[PDB]
Amino acid sequence: HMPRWKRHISEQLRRRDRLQRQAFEEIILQYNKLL
Amino acid sequence: MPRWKRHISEQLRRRDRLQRQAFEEIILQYNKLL
Amino acid sequence: DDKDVLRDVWFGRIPTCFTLYQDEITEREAEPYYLLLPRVSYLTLVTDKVKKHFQKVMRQEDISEIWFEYEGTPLKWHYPIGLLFDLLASSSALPWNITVHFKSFPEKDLLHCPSKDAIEAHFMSCMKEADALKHKSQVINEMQKKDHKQLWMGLQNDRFDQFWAINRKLMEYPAEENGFRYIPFRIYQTTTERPFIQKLFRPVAADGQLHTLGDLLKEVCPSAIDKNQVMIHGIEPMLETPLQWLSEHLSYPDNFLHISIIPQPTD
Amino acid sequence: DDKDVLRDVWFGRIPTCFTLYQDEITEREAEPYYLLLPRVSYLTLVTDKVKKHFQKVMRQEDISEIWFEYEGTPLKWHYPIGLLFDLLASSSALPWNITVHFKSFPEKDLLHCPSKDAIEAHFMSCMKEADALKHKSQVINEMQKKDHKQLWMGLQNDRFDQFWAINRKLMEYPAEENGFRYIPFRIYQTTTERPFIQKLFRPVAADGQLHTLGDLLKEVCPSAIKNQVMIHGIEPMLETPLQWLSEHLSYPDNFLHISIIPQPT
Amino acid sequence: KKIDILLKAVGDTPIMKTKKWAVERTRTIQGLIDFIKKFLKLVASEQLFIYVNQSFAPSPDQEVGTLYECFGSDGKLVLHYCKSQAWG
Amino acid sequence: KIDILLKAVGDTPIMKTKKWAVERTRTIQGLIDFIKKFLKLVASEQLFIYVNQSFAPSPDQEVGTLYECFGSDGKLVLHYCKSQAWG
Ligand code: NA
Numbered sequence: 171h172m173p174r175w176k177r178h179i180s181e182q183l184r185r186r187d188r189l190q191r192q193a194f195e196e197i198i199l200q201y202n203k204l205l
Numbered sequence: 206m207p208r209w210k211r212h213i214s215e216q217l218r219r220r221d222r223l224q225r226q227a228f229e230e231i232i233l234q235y236n237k238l239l
Numbered sequence: 240d241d242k243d244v245l246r247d248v249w250f251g252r253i254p255t256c257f258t259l260y261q262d263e264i265t266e267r268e269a270e271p272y273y274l275l276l277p278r279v280s281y282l283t284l285v286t287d288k289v290k291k292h293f294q295k296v297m298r299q300e301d302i303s304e305i306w307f308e309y310e311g312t313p314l315k316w317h318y319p320i321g322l323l324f325d326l327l328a329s330s331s332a333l334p335w336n337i338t339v340h341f342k343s344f345p346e347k348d349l350l351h352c353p354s355k356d357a358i359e360a361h362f363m364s365c366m367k368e369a370d371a372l373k374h375k376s377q378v379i380n381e382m383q384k385k386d387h388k389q390l391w392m393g394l395q396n397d398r399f400d401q402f403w404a405i406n407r408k409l410m411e412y413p414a415e416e417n418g419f420r421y422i423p424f425r426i427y428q429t430t431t432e433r434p435f436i437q438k439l440f441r442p443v444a445a446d447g448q449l450h451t452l453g454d455l456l457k458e459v460c461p462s463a464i465d466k467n468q469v470m471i472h473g474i475e476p477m478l479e480t481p482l483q484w485l486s487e488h489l490s491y492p493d494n495f496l497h498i499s500i501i502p503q504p505t506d
Numbered sequence: 507d508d509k510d511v512l513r514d515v516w517f518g519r520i521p522t523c524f525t526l527y528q529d530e531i532t533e534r535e536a537e538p539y540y541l542l543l544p545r546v547s548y549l550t551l552v553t554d555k556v557k558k559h560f561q562k563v564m565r566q567e568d569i570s571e572i573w574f575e576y577e578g579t580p581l582k583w584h585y586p587i588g589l590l591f592d593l594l595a596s597s598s599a600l601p602w603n604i605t606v607h608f609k610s611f612p613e614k615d616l617l618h619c620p621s622k623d624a625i626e627a628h629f630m631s632c633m634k635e636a637d638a639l640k641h642k643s644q645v646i647n648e649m650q651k652k653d654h655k656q657l658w659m660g661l662q663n664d665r666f667d668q669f670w671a672i673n674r675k676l677m678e679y680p681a682e683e684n685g686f687r688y689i690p691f692r693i694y695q696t697t698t699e700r701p702f703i704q705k706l707f708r709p710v711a712a713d714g715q716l717h718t719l720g721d722l723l724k725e726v727c728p729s730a731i732k733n734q735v736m737i738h739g740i741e742p743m744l745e746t747p748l749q750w751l752s753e754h755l756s757y758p759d760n761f762l763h764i765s766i767i768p769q770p771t
Numbered sequence: 772k773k774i775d776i777l778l779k780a781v782g783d784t785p786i787m788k789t790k791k792w793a794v795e796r797t798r799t800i801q802g803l804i805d806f807i808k809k810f811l812k813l814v815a816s817e818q819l820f821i822y823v824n825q826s827f828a829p830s831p832d833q834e835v836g837t838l839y840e841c842f843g844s845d846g847k848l849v850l851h852y853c854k855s856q857a858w859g
Numbered sequence: 860k861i862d863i864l865l866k867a868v869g870d871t872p873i874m875k876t877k878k879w880a881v882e883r884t885r886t887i888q889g890l891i892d893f894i895k896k897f898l899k900l901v902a903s904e905q906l907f908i909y910v911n912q913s914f915a916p917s918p919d920q921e922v923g924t925l926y927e928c929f930g931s932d933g934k935l936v937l938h939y940c941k942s943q944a945w946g
């Protein structure tokens with residue numbers, strides 16, 4: 171059992187990666203192949 | 206405007222911004238260089 | 240006003256990445272095809288450019304009926320696109336990763352889609368079933384054959400005003416009443432065995448009050464109200480939303496209210 | 507645990523679309539260039555491929571010191587990429603639309619970046635200033651020159667382990683104590699004259715109790731509790747211990763850059 | 772946990788001898804179609820359409836129990852079978 | 860206003876006036892270019908400024924901010940030098 175504020179931070183960072191990094195990494199990588 | 210109707214309009218606009226607007230230009234560009 | 244909601248629903252787009260299955264035999268490397276899918280339409284109706292794309296890199300002897308899958312789950316072409324995404328991939332990272340196949344069509348998981356006429360037949364069946372619940376089939380079975388085509392052409396050609404010119408007739412009800420006879424809905428849930436829940440439910444209460452989305456769920460799916468998301472067209476409407484209004488403004492073109500019960504996102 | 511948080515902060519990326527400014531003298535129209543920018547790093551350190559891209563369409567006489575702007579605002583390169591985005595564009599839709607410029611350098615808005623040695627010096631100036639607040643410079647001064655170089659190479663080469671094999675020493679503190687002397691923080695806000703707020707703040711109180719994020723904010727910027735408190739693209743709870751944040755959610759420069767932005771709609 | 776199905780014919784299709792059946796609620800339209808084809812001496816390739824309310828043709832993957840609760844009448848679900856598109 | 864005392868670390872030309880009263884919003888870079896003139900130093904020549912005799916502050920940093928964090932006795936001591944006195 172980790173504190174609630176620490177659990178919140180971990181989830182928020184993973185939420186962020188999903189909305190930001192993971193949404194664009196593949197398409198950007200694929201776009202640069204055909205550039 | 207009822208509370209629940211305002212909620213739906215806002216959510217639909219949020220949905221489009223996240224799902225369509227974010228990808229529209231990049232997909233259009235990728236489709237060109239193919 | 241309400242018409243703005245109708246447009247927002249109609250023009251719903253899902254960013255999708257089509258990737259050819261690894262074990263398909265290709266003449267050369269196949270590039271993934273990116274596409275904005277219409278939420279309200281069907282996969283086999285809007286993916287001609289996708290089909291043409293991957294067919295370029297395949298011998299004629301190797302091309303078959305095309306079929307799609309998400310994370311091992313064959314996508315039923317007869318479910319609207321928005322429903323499939325909401326139900327299967329809404330909590331995953333965009334874009335929607337659909338794998339394109341040709342060989343080994345899963346007979347036990349998918350109905351074949353042999354032509355676009357098959358699609359139009361399925362779409363008209365859904366409308367007819369919906370209107371049976373709404374007006375005892377009185378509105379749609381009194382339309383001209385010309386109107387049944389305008390509905391279809393409206394859907395196929397992404398023509399909003401053309402579609403609603405006819406569909407608005409199906410969204411009206413007699414003056415003395417305050418809604419449809421029964422509301423056309425389908426409740427989907429992956430954890431459950433049954434494909435979907437569809438029962439009879441009246442939009443107006445005894446004392447003449449409008450039933451809500453919450454009332455409907457309380458009545459036909461109480462288990463979804465304890466933790467779960469109630470997702471319609473990719474958004475989560477307030478439970479207090481009038482069910483009659485929802486049926487009119489958040490139905491798919493098939494006139495059904497397709498509702499997904501999904502777990503809340505982990506992270 | 508705590509290490510997974512370090513890795514997630516370190517590997518944070520921001521999808522970005524570089525478009526060439528339309529008034530740049532070019533032989534031909536250039537295509538927009540897409541790139542995943544590292545949050546923890548600097549624009550002039552990670553955009554070599556971008557510079558090469560837009561220079562293919564330009565004469566050697568037309569090129570100069572490159573610079574970037576978002577929505578008219580010149581992007582200060584010495585501010586970490588993640589901070590710049592959280593402060594300026596986190597409200598807008600992805601990807602980040604950055605406009606690439608060459609001609610007409612804004613002398614009064616940005617600091618020139620003549621070399622990658624200029625970036626290293628600035629990075630080291632931030633670390634040494636941080637350790638001055640945390641340990642009276644004691645920890646960072648007792649390192650060999652090779653350790654300073656490794657800290658830099660770790661950031662430049664995007665090597666988490668290489669970087670943290672040295673940076674771990676800068677997060678230590680006396681056993682008798684329960685944190686650093688002062689916490690290195692800079693609070694940024696778009697509607698203020700000052701570039702940022704940086705004041706002396708102790709992580710523990712008289713009781714030996716840990717000050718929270720909220721405690722810091724109530725002290726140095728109470729006009730933020732309608733507004734959003736963002737660090738590394740996330741909004742941590744106000745009850746979060748400041749000492750832990752400093753150890754885990756700081757940028758490689760050992761500073762806790764905090765964005766105060768209006769709540770979107 | 773079964774429901775009554777009354778099968779009515781729309782020519783020109785072979786007629787069923789036994790028209791009243793007690794069917795599992797989870798049985799689909801297609802499983803019901805294949806059940807009928809064997810009685811009517813119809814092969815797999817030959818199409819057999821099934822209608823509800825003399826109006827629409829439900830999807831072959833649609834369960835009968837659901838169709839009953841929505842479109843049943845007097846304790847039974849009336850289904851018309853035909854070898855062509857009767858109603859559109 | 861911030862009271863600033865300037866101290867030299869050789870081999871560096873010495874400022875004739877070492878005690879200055881500057882604005883809070885003035886930058887380190889603004890002071891470097893300020894001092895360079897008095898020392899007869901051109902742009903290409905380098906001049907480092909140090910706080911607490913340990914770190915060379917960022918050139919964008921404001922004098923006032925540095926005072927609140929590292930100031931003592933009602934003033935901010937800055938050491939200047941033509942070479943890297945401290946690392
Ligand atoms: Na995905």
Ligand code: NA
Nearest residue numbers: 599600601603
């Ligand atoms: Na953008």
